[PDB]
């Protein structure tokens, strides 16, 4: 599955792109 993520994406996956949630930043991990 893909996730926003924070801090940062887990081994095994990319940062693709980026998430804004909740008035935070994530990264979007896949």
Do not use: S, V
């Not at 996730?3 to 994530?26: D, K, N, S, V």
């Amino acid at each position: 599955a893909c996730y926003c993520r924070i801090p940062a994406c887990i081994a095994g996956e990319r940062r693709y792109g980026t998430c804004i949630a909740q008035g935070r930043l994530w990264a979007f991990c896949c």
